[PDB]
Write a protein that binds this ligand. Sequence first.
Ligand SMILES: CCCCC/C=C\C/C=C\CCCCCCCC(=O)OC[C@H](COP(=O)([O-])OCC[N+](C)(C)C)OC(=O)CCCCCCC/C=C\C/C=C\CCCCC
Length: 203
Amino acid sequence: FSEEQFWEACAELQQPALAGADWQLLVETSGISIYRLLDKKTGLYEYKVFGVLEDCSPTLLADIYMDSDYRKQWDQYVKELYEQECNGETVVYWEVKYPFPMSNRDYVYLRQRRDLDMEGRKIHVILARSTSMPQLGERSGVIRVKQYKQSLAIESDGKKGSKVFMYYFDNPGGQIPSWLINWAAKNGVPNFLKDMARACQNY
Ligand SMILES: CCCCC/C=C\C/C=C\CCCCCCCC(=O)OC[C@H](COP(=O)([O-])OCC[N+](C)(C)C)OC(=O)CCCCCCC/C=C\C/C=C\CCCCC
């Protein structure tokens, strides 16, 4: 994870670039919006998350975004989650619960935080990216997501919470039913952001 990449995760935090392509909104909740951009040739999507979360310190949100022990405790979709050091870098293992019949997806990835000061503005950036380890091969029954990259930026909203900007992408290695995106858009994520807000109140 280079310097530049961290800097790059701050751009849309101030100003949302979405005009270059067909980003369509998909969700608005708790003052958070999710845009998605379909890659017509692969059926694959990219997501962008903007918004605010009052009632949750930028600095809280960051620490919690990093706390696996805690995440395992409050996040209902985590089936398994743990960290190990490999070389000098932290490697995260995360298995996500999928609505059966669908098999869960699990991730092996590098995750790194950096609290920045961009012109006196104190921001928090976390980038994630896929990696592989010979000791951690694929598990039968679970779908290993081999392509995954994410970035997230947290600034205060000046008031009680924090404004964020998240960029997301992975190849779930199998079709994702529209119904699941519909459950996700309309109930899944809305309820998540809530438990998370609430999990932030009880740190
Ligand atoms: C809004 C419209 C919905 C769009 C469709 C989304 C998903 C459809 C595909 C599969 C859904 C199956 C059910 C899974 C439960 C989803 C409920 C939820 O809502 O699960 C939050 C969570 C954020 O994962 P994570 O970033 O915490 O770490 C993630 C690390 N690993 C990637 C390794 C897991 O979703 C995930 O993993 C799944 C990957 C999708 C993430 C893309 C949008 C992000 C949605 C919510 C996050 C937005 C704001 C909160 C984030 C912090 C605020 C600064």
